[PDB]
Amino acid sequence: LSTGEASVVLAEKIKGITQQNDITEYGTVISIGDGIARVFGLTKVQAGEMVEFKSGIR
Protein backbone atom coordinates (compact mmCIF):
# COMPACT_ATOMS: atom_id res chain seq x y z
CA LEU A 1 0.00 0.00 0.00
CA SER A 2 0.97 3.66 -0.36
CA THR A 3 -0.41 7.13 0.29
CA GLY A 4 -0.02 8.17 -3.35
CA GLU A 5 -2.82 5.84 -4.46
CA ALA A 6 -5.11 8.87 -4.79
CA SER A 7 -3.86 9.41 -8.34
CA VAL A 8 -4.42 5.71 -9.07
CA VAL A 9 -7.99 5.85 -7.77
CA LEU A 10 -8.57 9.15 -9.57
CA ALA A 11 -7.39 7.65 -12.86
CA GLU A 12 -9.60 4.57 -12.52
CA LYS A 13 -12.49 6.86 -11.56
CA ILE A 14 -12.45 9.04 -14.68
CA LYS A 15 -12.27 6.05 -17.06
CA GLY A 16 -13.98 3.25 -15.14
CA ILE A 17 -17.35 5.02 -15.15
CA THR A 18 -18.91 7.23 -17.84
CA GLN A 19 -20.28 9.53 -15.16
CA GLN A 20 -19.13 12.13 -12.60
CA ASN A 21 -19.95 15.28 -14.53
CA ASP A 22 -19.53 18.76 -13.04
CA ILE A 23 -20.90 17.92 -9.59
CA THR A 24 -21.03 21.56 -8.49
CA GLU A 25 -23.66 22.23 -11.18
CA TYR A 26 -25.06 18.75 -11.99
CA GLY A 27 -26.59 15.94 -9.96
CA THR A 28 -27.91 12.40 -10.19
CA VAL A 29 -31.33 11.15 -9.08
CA ILE A 30 -30.89 8.38 -6.52
CA SER A 31 -34.63 7.71 -6.28
CA ILE A 32 -37.95 9.15 -7.42
CA GLY A 33 -41.37 8.70 -5.83
CA ASP A 34 -44.22 10.40 -3.97
CA GLY A 35 -43.46 13.65 -5.76
CA ILE A 36 -39.93 13.69 -4.32
CA ALA A 37 -36.58 13.07 -6.02
CA ARG A 38 -33.33 12.22 -4.21
CA VAL A 39 -30.76 14.14 -6.22
CA PHE A 40 -27.07 13.33 -5.71
CA GLY A 41 -24.00 15.54 -5.83
CA LEU A 42 -26.05 18.72 -6.27
CA THR A 43 -23.58 20.72 -4.20
CA LYS A 44 -23.64 24.54 -4.04
CA VAL A 45 -27.43 24.57 -4.49
CA GLN A 46 -29.35 27.22 -2.56
CA ALA A 47 -32.48 26.64 -0.50
CA GLY A 48 -35.37 27.44 -2.82
CA GLU A 49 -33.18 27.27 -5.92
CA MET A 50 -34.95 26.29 -9.14
CA VAL A 51 -33.51 23.12 -10.69
CA GLU A 52 -34.33 21.46 -14.01
CA PHE A 53 -34.37 17.74 -14.80
CA LYS A 54 -33.53 15.92 -18.03
CA SER A 55 -37.02 15.98 -19.57
CA GLY A 56 -37.22 19.75 -18.99
CA ILE A 57 -39.53 19.62 -15.97
CA ARG A 58 -38.42 22.03 -13.25
Binding site: V8, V9, E12, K13, G16, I17, I30
Partner: protein, 188 residues
Protein backbone atom coordinates in the same frame (compact mmCIF):
# COMPACT_ATOMS: atom_id res chain seq x y z
CA UNK B 1 -8.59 -13.74 23.47
CA UNK B 2 -11.69 -15.87 22.91
CA UNK B 3 -12.70 -14.29 19.58
CA UNK B 4 -14.88 -11.86 21.56
CA UNK B 5 -14.58 -8.12 20.82
CA UNK B 6 -14.45 -5.79 23.84
CA UNK B 7 -18.08 -4.67 23.46
CA UNK B 8 -21.09 -5.72 21.38
CA UNK B 9 -23.13 -3.02 19.63
CA UNK B 10 -26.04 -3.08 17.19
CA UNK B 11 -24.94 0.07 15.35
CA UNK B 12 -24.10 -0.21 11.65
CA UNK B 13 -20.41 0.61 12.08
CA UNK B 14 -20.36 -1.29 15.37
CA UNK B 15 -21.76 -4.48 13.84
CA UNK B 16 -19.17 -4.73 11.06
CA UNK B 17 -16.34 -3.69 13.39
CA UNK B 18 -17.30 -6.40 15.89
CA UNK B 19 -17.64 -9.13 13.26
CA UNK B 20 -14.32 -8.15 11.68
CA UNK B 21 -12.52 -8.15 15.03
CA UNK B 22 -13.95 -11.55 15.95
CA UNK B 23 -13.33 -13.05 12.51
CA UNK B 24 -9.87 -11.48 12.31
CA UNK B 25 -8.91 -12.43 15.87
CA UNK B 26 -10.25 -15.94 15.20
CA UNK B 27 -7.69 -17.53 12.87
CA UNK B 28 -4.40 -15.88 13.88
CA UNK B 29 -4.23 -12.14 13.18
CA UNK B 30 -5.38 -8.85 14.70
CA UNK B 31 -2.59 -6.38 13.94
CA UNK B 32 -2.66 -7.05 10.18
CA UNK B 33 -6.29 -5.92 9.93
CA UNK B 34 -5.55 -3.04 12.30
CA UNK B 35 -2.92 -1.64 9.94
CA UNK B 36 -5.22 -2.14 6.95
CA UNK B 37 -8.15 -0.25 8.47
CA UNK B 38 -5.73 2.41 9.73
CA UNK B 39 -4.53 2.95 6.16
CA UNK B 40 -8.09 3.72 5.05
CA UNK B 41 -8.47 6.22 7.90
CA UNK B 42 -5.31 8.07 6.89
CA UNK B 43 -6.26 7.92 3.21
CA UNK B 44 -9.87 8.90 3.95
CA UNK B 45 -8.63 12.18 5.46
CA UNK B 46 -5.60 12.82 3.23
CA UNK B 47 -7.07 12.06 -0.21
CA UNK B 48 -10.12 14.19 -1.01
CA UNK B 49 -11.21 12.15 -4.04
CA UNK B 50 -11.26 8.98 -1.93
CA UNK B 51 -13.71 10.59 0.51
CA UNK B 52 -16.18 11.46 -2.24
CA UNK B 53 -15.94 7.89 -3.56
CA UNK B 54 -17.06 6.26 -0.32
CA UNK B 55 -19.71 8.91 0.36
CA UNK B 56 -21.02 8.35 -3.17
CA UNK B 57 -24.14 6.19 -3.02
CA UNK B 58 -25.52 6.50 -6.58
CA UNK B 59 -22.54 4.49 -7.87
CA UNK B 60 -23.16 0.96 -9.09
CA UNK B 61 -21.85 -2.13 -7.33
CA UNK B 62 -19.82 -3.27 -10.34
CA UNK B 63 -18.34 0.22 -10.64
CA UNK B 64 -17.36 0.33 -6.96
CA UNK B 65 -15.63 -3.06 -7.21
CA UNK B 66 -13.46 -1.90 -10.12
CA UNK B 67 -12.34 1.22 -8.24
CA UNK B 68 -11.57 -0.74 -5.06
CA UNK B 69 -9.42 -3.20 -7.01
CA UNK B 70 -7.50 -0.31 -8.57
CA UNK B 71 -6.58 0.94 -5.08
CA UNK B 72 -4.83 -2.26 -4.03
CA UNK B 73 -5.32 -6.03 -4.05
CA UNK B 74 -2.28 -6.87 -1.88
CA UNK B 75 -0.99 -5.58 1.49
CA UNK B 76 -4.56 -5.89 2.88
CA UNK B 77 -5.52 -8.76 5.16
CA UNK B 78 -8.08 -11.12 3.57
CA UNK B 79 -10.54 -10.10 6.30
CA UNK B 80 -10.34 -6.51 5.04
CA UNK B 81 -10.81 -7.54 1.41
CA UNK B 82 -13.81 -9.71 2.30
CA UNK B 83 -15.25 -6.86 4.37
CA UNK B 84 -15.10 -4.40 1.46
CA UNK B 85 -16.76 -6.91 -0.88
CA UNK B 86 -19.59 -7.28 1.63
CA UNK B 87 -20.12 -3.52 1.91
CA UNK B 88 -20.39 -3.16 -1.87
CA UNK B 89 -22.99 -5.94 -1.97
CA UNK B 90 -24.97 -4.34 0.88
CA UNK B 91 -24.48 -0.73 -0.32
CA UNK B 92 -22.70 -0.05 3.00
CA UNK B 93 -19.65 1.50 1.33
CA UNK B 94 -20.66 4.91 2.70
CA UNK B 95 -20.24 3.51 6.23
CA UNK B 96 -16.65 2.43 5.48
CA UNK B 97 -14.88 5.20 7.47
CA UNK B 98 -16.96 4.69 10.61
CA UNK B 99 -16.26 0.95 10.49
CA UNK B 100 -12.53 1.62 10.12
CA UNK B 101 -12.44 4.00 13.08
CA UNK B 102 -14.75 1.81 15.17
CA UNK B 103 -12.50 -1.19 14.52
CA UNK B 104 -9.42 0.63 15.80
CA UNK B 105 -11.28 1.45 19.02
CA UNK B 106 -11.66 -2.25 19.85
CA UNK B 107 -7.99 -2.74 18.99
CA UNK B 108 -7.01 0.15 21.25
CA UNK B 109 -9.04 -1.49 24.03
CA UNK B 110 -6.91 -4.63 23.69
CA UNK B 111 -3.80 -2.44 23.94
CA UNK B 112 -2.46 -2.59 27.49
CA UNK B 113 -0.74 0.81 27.44
CA UNK B 114 -2.84 3.57 29.00
CA UNK B 115 -2.47 7.32 29.51
CA UNK B 116 -2.85 8.82 32.99
CA UNK B 117 -3.55 12.55 33.31
CA UNK B 118 -2.87 14.47 36.53
CA UNK B 119 -4.65 17.76 37.21
CA UNK B 120 -3.06 20.16 39.70
CA UNK B 121 -3.47 23.88 40.34
CA UNK B 122 0.06 24.71 41.49
CA UNK B 123 2.88 24.01 39.06
CA UNK B 124 4.47 20.58 39.49
CA UNK B 125 8.16 20.91 40.32
CA UNK B 126 10.61 18.52 38.68
CA UNK B 127 11.30 16.91 42.06
CA UNK B 128 7.59 16.83 42.94
CA UNK B 129 6.69 15.10 39.67
CA UNK B 130 9.23 12.36 40.43
CA UNK B 131 7.36 11.57 43.65
CA UNK B 132 4.10 11.35 41.68
CA UNK B 133 5.59 8.61 39.49
CA UNK B 134 6.57 6.50 42.50
CA UNK B 135 3.06 6.81 43.91
CA UNK B 136 1.34 5.82 40.68
CA UNK B 137 3.93 3.11 40.01
CA UNK B 138 3.72 1.66 43.52
CA UNK B 139 -0.07 1.83 43.24
CA UNK B 140 -0.29 -0.38 40.17
CA UNK B 141 3.22 -1.91 40.11
CA UNK B 142 2.06 -4.39 37.44
CA UNK B 143 1.23 -2.33 34.31
CA UNK B 144 3.23 0.23 32.35
CA UNK B 145 1.63 3.61 31.69
CA UNK B 146 2.35 7.00 30.13
CA UNK B 147 1.80 10.16 32.18
CA UNK B 148 0.37 13.42 30.84
CA UNK B 149 0.10 16.80 32.54
CA UNK B 150 -2.55 19.52 32.33
CA UNK B 151 -2.77 22.36 34.87
CA UNK B 152 -5.81 24.60 34.48
CA UNK B 153 -8.17 23.65 37.35
CA UNK B 154 -10.40 25.64 39.67
CA UNK B 155 -9.33 23.71 42.80
CA UNK B 156 -6.30 24.83 44.82
CA UNK B 157 -3.51 22.43 45.76
CA UNK B 158 -5.71 19.51 44.70
CA UNK B 159 -4.86 16.38 42.71
CA UNK B 160 -7.26 14.67 40.30
CA UNK B 161 -6.18 11.73 38.14
CA UNK B 162 -7.78 10.50 34.92
CA UNK B 163 -6.61 7.03 33.82
CA UNK B 164 -8.41 6.04 30.64
CA UNK B 165 -11.84 5.56 32.20
CA UNK B 166 -11.25 5.81 35.98
CA UNK B 167 -11.30 8.94 38.14
CA UNK B 168 -9.86 9.27 41.66
CA UNK B 169 -10.30 12.58 43.48
CA UNK B 170 -7.59 13.62 45.94
CA UNK B 171 -8.33 17.33 45.60
CA UNK B 172 -8.28 19.61 48.63
CA UNK B 173 -11.36 21.37 47.25
CA UNK B 174 -13.37 18.20 47.88
CA UNK B 175 -12.16 18.14 51.48
CA UNK B 176 -13.11 21.79 52.06
CA UNK B 177 -16.68 21.33 50.82
CA UNK B 178 -17.09 18.08 52.77
CA UNK B 179 -16.22 19.72 56.09
CA UNK B 180 -18.23 22.90 55.53
CA UNK B 181 -21.30 20.76 54.81
CA UNK B 182 -20.96 18.39 57.77
CA UNK B 183 -20.26 21.29 60.15
CA UNK B 184 -23.57 22.82 59.02
CA UNK B 185 -25.62 19.64 59.53
CA UNK B 186 -24.40 19.17 63.12
CA UNK B 187 -27.99 19.75 64.29
CA UNK B 188 -26.70 20.95 67.66
Amino acid sequence: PGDKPPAIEDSIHGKYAGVLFSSASSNKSLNKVAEDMKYFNQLYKESEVFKSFLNNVSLKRNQQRDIISALGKTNFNPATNNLLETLIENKRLDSLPKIAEKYMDYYRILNKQESITIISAQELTAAEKQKVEQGLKKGNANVQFTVVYQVDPAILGGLQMYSGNNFLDCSLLSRVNKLKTEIAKISF
